[PDB]
Design a protein around this ligand. Sequence first.
Ligand SMILES: N#Cc1ccc2c(Oc3ccccc3OCCn3ccc(=S)[nH]c3=O)cccc2c1
Ligand SMILES: N#Cc1ccc2c(Oc3ccccc3OCCn3ccc(=S)[nH]c3=O)cccc2c1
Ligand SMILES: N#Cc1ccc2c(Oc3ccccc3OCCn3ccc(=S)[nH]c3=O)cccc2c1
Ligand SMILES: N#Cc1ccc2c(Oc3ccccc3OCCn3ccc(=S)[nH]c3=O)cccc2c1
Lengths: 425, 298, 509, 396
Amino acid sequence: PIETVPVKLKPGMDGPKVKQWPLTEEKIKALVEICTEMEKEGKISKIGPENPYNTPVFWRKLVDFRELNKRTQDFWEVQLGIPHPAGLKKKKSVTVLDVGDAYFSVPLDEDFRKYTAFTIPSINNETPGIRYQYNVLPQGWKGSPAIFQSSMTKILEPFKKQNPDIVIYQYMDDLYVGSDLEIGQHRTKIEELRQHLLRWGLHQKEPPFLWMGYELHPDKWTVQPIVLPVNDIQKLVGKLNWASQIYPGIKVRQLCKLLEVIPLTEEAELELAENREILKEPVHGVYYDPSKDLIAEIQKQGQGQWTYQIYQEPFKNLKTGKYARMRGAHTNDVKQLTEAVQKITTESIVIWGKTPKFKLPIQKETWETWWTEYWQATWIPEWEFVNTPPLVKLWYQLLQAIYLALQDSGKSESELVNQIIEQLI
Amino acid sequence: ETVPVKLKPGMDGPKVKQWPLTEEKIKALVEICTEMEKEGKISKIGPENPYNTPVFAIKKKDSTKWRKLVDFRELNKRTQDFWEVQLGIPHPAGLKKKKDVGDAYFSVPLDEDFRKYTAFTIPSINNETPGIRYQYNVLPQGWKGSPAIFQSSMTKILEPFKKQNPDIVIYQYMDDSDLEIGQHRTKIEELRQHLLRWGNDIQKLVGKLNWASQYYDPSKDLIAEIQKQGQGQWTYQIYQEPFKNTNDVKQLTEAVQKITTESIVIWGKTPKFKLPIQKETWETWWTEYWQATWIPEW
Amino acid sequence: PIETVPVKLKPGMDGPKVKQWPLTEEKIKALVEICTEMEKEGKISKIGPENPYNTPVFAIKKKDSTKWRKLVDFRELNKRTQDFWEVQLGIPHPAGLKKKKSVTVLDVGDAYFSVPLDEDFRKYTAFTIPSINNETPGIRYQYNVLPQGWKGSPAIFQSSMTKILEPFKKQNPDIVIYQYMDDLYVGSDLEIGQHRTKIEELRQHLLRWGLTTPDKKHQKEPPFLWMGYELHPDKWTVQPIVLPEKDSWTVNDIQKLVGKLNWASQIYPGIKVRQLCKLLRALTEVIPLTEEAELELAENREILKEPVHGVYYDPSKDLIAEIQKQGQGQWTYQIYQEPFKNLKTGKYARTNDVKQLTEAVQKITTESIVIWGKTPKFKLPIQKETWETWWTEYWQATWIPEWEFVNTPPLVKLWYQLEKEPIVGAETFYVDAGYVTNKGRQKNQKTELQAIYLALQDSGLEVNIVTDSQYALGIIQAQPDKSESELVNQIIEQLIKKEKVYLAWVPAH
Amino acid sequence: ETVPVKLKPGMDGPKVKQWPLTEEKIKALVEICTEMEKEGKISKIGPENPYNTPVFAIKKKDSTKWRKLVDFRELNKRTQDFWEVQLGIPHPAGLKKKKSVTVLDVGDAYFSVPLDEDFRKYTAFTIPSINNETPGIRYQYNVLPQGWKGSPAIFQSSMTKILEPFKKQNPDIVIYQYMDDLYVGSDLEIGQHRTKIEELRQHLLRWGLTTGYELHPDKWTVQPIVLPEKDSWTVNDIQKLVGKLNWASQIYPGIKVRQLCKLLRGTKALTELTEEAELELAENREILKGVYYDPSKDLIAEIQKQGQGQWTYQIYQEPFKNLKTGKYARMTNDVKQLTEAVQKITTESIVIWGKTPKFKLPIQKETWETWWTEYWQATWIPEWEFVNTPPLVKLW
Ligand SMILES: N#Cc1ccc2c(Oc3ccccc3OCCn3ccc(=S)[nH]c3=O)cccc2c1
Ligand SMILES: N#Cc1ccc2c(Oc3ccccc3OCCn3ccc(=S)[nH]c3=O)cccc2c1
Ligand SMILES: N#Cc1ccc2c(Oc3ccccc3OCCn3ccc(=S)[nH]c3=O)cccc2c1
Ligand SMILES: N#Cc1ccc2c(Oc3ccccc3OCCn3ccc(=S)[nH]c3=O)cccc2c1
């Protein structure tokens, strides 16, 4: 029995009360049989009719706890995100300890038990409705995931502290454990973990492991099979985003600029075909090696889409990503790169825990010019030069219509000003 | 004894996100946190508490020491009117144009209500583990008004010192003259020992003014802003009402630190201003440069 | 013995040829296993190396699947295939369905594979199962039966099923056999024993032509859940709708919220989505709900709490539609054959109110033609005289079917009746706010409108006002009752309680 | 012996979705189409061929019968341009100067000619079903289409033989064939013309051809429009005059409006003369009371609603240049009045010139699409813009 956390209703609020609607004879019979199974297993309790509180209840039974969720202390939000496959350092062994009814296992304190009520009607109108309460952690309650996560963190403390080498990632219910130990020793450790979590009250799958659009392989992380499909444009942009992590050079600009349902534009077919051509090839990404250093790259797959590639050893990519310069206002190419650079450093600090050494097309003189003439103070941590086909700079070199006469003397849709600039340069 | 200090009526609790930090920083923060837990000053919080305050790490003069400065703006803003009324420390007039504390705060107990509000969280790299979170069971270092609960004990013993020499008066915004600075250094050393006992040109003329363009009352909005018209030009403006008066990021932040101190001296409050550098870009490097508990409004 | 439709490639396009990317052995076991079973069934047959056509296979295992399953991306053959007729995207609306004593649901099994394929296009549907270490060329296969994912496979199956059902439908007139994508929904007015005999007879006929049928016990129970509608015997109800209560709303989440609200608008009256949709004006980005928007969400939830049911169409009576103005720019309509029982309920979302009424009548009659086939006997808020006034004066043709007036608090009316004739015993005013008058008192679209307004209040009850901007003329002549714009609201407000006001345009000279 | 039919080079087939129809229309279409399939003019098709052209059902002659008007305009735009130069159809200028012109329907005779097997697929009609209960029955034309341009082209060789004796017997009668309609024009009196019309009908029935609505040419003259001469001058009237004079300036140059403008003299009471200004008005009155037709360009007929049961039609080849202008006085529902106006405009254009004008109909798209079929009695279907959204009307 995990130590029960104190849960307090929101001050100035009272327990929820909702009416119940009857259902079909087969449905209610199945539901009451399910409840009988729970009671014989002691899973739920039968609250008295004296309790004023109520909550709607609808073989899967769904409880709309939104009324109870209206009155509950805010709980700490579970850390939102996906452990990026690149951040996983290579472990000689891997496991999955999929736990069943993990949310169900957590108990609930006495005060908040009464505020959860369930009214399942009775056939022949013997009772207006059978009244129940959850003695376990309810589904969909605001605090169900956070309380469970904190309880798990407390529950695994004896095992993780003793062993520093073993690394255990926790996500939702499941537990992901990596060991550098041999298969024999690891069998002992996995048995200890299983018996320990069973001691506190809480058929294995086989490699390879695929999850959350992230196919995982010992020396390589590759996305799930990506196939290109208003909602169609939504799906098309969404698929390219998840494919942009490992398939370098994915272009999404034309769709974002594009968005009765209009069809794909004339150039949309060709751009989607280019994306499909890049998608055809199988690409993958290596898990980062702690001993060596992270290196970053920057290149232009297309204007408005600065693509960057974090690589540990050349020609092998740890990850690839896109920065959308076209989204938002058009700026100086060096400024576009600065925006991209900040994007890269945020990703680098969250995923790997360190800043990378950036190899960028912008020349050292050009970056120095950007520093000299700009109003913001944005800075790039590490500057290295790499030759790439697209190399960009600034044009000016640092309603007054006579400016056009001066030029004669020597939106992304408009380029007549660019012709004027070509005459200027 | 313990004096209750509360949030303003109809005010929600303090909740802000922890900007992810580098690994070298998190190592030092976790080691200092576990040390403090061994001392007993900080204790864990369950999932019941909804308050989260940001934790950043700073090192002073390459001393190989990093400190757990906690951005207390939100909770301090929430109880700001409360700490001022219960205890007042107006900034002295002599300090303007004049011709350390907080270590003992660890001994002070804290009331239940504010203790539960001050909750700091250490991050996790790549979401390896749900981040450890704590609560301050002793006096925090960074709450405006945190000195006030323990202010009486220090000033009551600082007064005998001030009895011998009236030249120096000290304001306590957070836990942190006429006498010749060398002689004042001698006096400061003796005071430290005492603490040990305690425990076109015409157009340019018009252009110059255009180039410039581009007493304290508690009810005044005194704003000090640091602007750099490029690396070459730096514009240092302070204002009360509108129209009325090297790493680039490091320069901006250090100048901001200095002007925040200047505003604290003259007006007893940290100025409220917006950074010219992009706030995301600022956040990438804000942690390195500030070296005091004082936190600008941003 | 089903006949094979003549299917050909698009003229001038060679047969597509694709190469399979390597795949891990654990997959290459399940795929070869399922292929061997298919060969036994006759659905797939081996192809010799002479055929030059090959397509890619990507193996996918669904959630809670023990064995990895086969997916063939026939997109290359889809790009190159004779265009086929498109199956009707619309599904039968429950309201149109007449009540019959017994309705039984039959689902044919492996429907695509029961249909045979033309000999010509059997060859093009060929793929190479992946090979490991290049030890063998790899097993290569072609589909005798229709492929799933092909462009025209649903159309060919639809034609096959339609032709198979024609002998049964001709022989039995009472039975109505709706056809969904893969199921036959059968209904008769006969007694349930005779009906059961008829359904088993249909099963035997379909099996004679090679399409499997569900067992008598396995046929679905009387309450049916289909495409978001629960079709109870004497009522149709939209499936239980749950509204998320999350504090921060993703743009995707707001889209889903609007989708669910529109889904439940067909049976739940007065669901307002215009404000939420206005808030929808990065997909992850969150928007703070206006106080108006959260009030709208709250009243929507209040409606959603109670259960509502609609009734199936009965042929004898006559459909009657009543339009009610829920709000400015929003209209709510109910289609009821008998009072207090609604076949369906709809919402029209949007400048004169009677013009919007005309648009709403058009939408209602289009929907009624699609579903029931007869335009309703409309019941509308506006009175007869105002409708006659709008018909004779409007610039564009307007027609409304037979309409009988009903009295509701929010009647549809024109707030001001402008003057096209100059009025005697009145002062004429010229407006640039010029406010020039016959007395001589004196003082870009916004300027032209606001000058007219300032003249209106300055003028008094009766006046003649001239302006050179057709924008102002259009604003006034349109007679907006919505008054969405504050300036426009000012002009409209001043125009209301006046005996006569004449607006005119002077050509520039 | 099927005449070769081919699409215009590089042209795709018809793919147009069928509008939903009232239940009675669908039942009538089902019965008529079943009889036609039994006879053999049409036959069912499967999903192999993805071609569709719309079907509509119209009542005829105010009689208890339902006639089918397949909208073959899209297939016309593709094949008729190819066939008109290939086969051709002359236009007689004498039809517009006859005393009386009648119209007859020669549709039934088109049911005998067979159609090339290659072009059969491009003509397919789908009869829709209510509530999407069943896939719509799809048929195709195995017999010469009725109401498709080029049916007169193919049947012209037979028709010239059919009408040769009647033309040889009577030189005065003048005949033109356009989309199943035969136009008989004569300078004889009404009683004289009707007997010969009966003669031609009997002649058609003698040869096996199976086959009213008299239009009187030379009874139509372009209506001049003159602003009324004011017995007493009125300022509001003067402003209306100057606006209409500018509009007429766009139509006909040379009008001088300044004289009325000077009389306005800035600020005056809206309710309240110079001889020279009067003289200007008289000369402009007579003046108000390009003309040649480019065969390649397509006529556009613009309809303006003056209200109170009156409509005005301007048939013009190019904007601002009007080939004919008239006012349709109307005896109801606005849709029926617009439909009668459209039919009269088209039938008047056909006599004067070959083409049927493209219509700028003043009605919202949904209302026209929903209500046009019931009030329509003419086999030909004009090409129309469903709506001109802005009023686009000067003061009038
Ligand atoms: N489904 C599922 C699933 C399985 C394992 C996961 C995972 O594993 C580790 C867990 C803990 C430490 C290292 C880990 O792995 C790094 C190295 N590594 C990576 C992959 C493989 S297959 N083997 C291997 O050694 C971390 C995060 C999510 C996981 C999800
Ligand atoms: N995001 C998202 C998403 C999810 C499902 C999709 C999909 O499935 C169904 C679509 C319709 C009915 C059943 C389906 O299947 C079970 C539902 N289900 C759920 C999760 C997963 S990962 N897969 C899956 O199939 C078809 C097409 C796109 C889909 C997108
Ligand atoms: N899942 C599923 C499912 C089940 C039936 C459907 C359906 O049924 C009919 C099919 C044919 C005639 C009438 C029908 O139903 C009218 C209304 N109705 C409804 C229920 C009862 S018990 N009786 C009754 O009359 C039509 C369309 C889709 C369907 C989907
Ligand atoms: N196209 C499509 C599509 C999308 C979701 C479907 C669906 O939801 C899931 C139910 C359970 C797990 C995952 C689900 O889907 C992924 C996440 N998710 C959840 C809810 C919604 S509305 N959309 C969504 O993407 C169940 C069955 C069919 C679905 C089809």
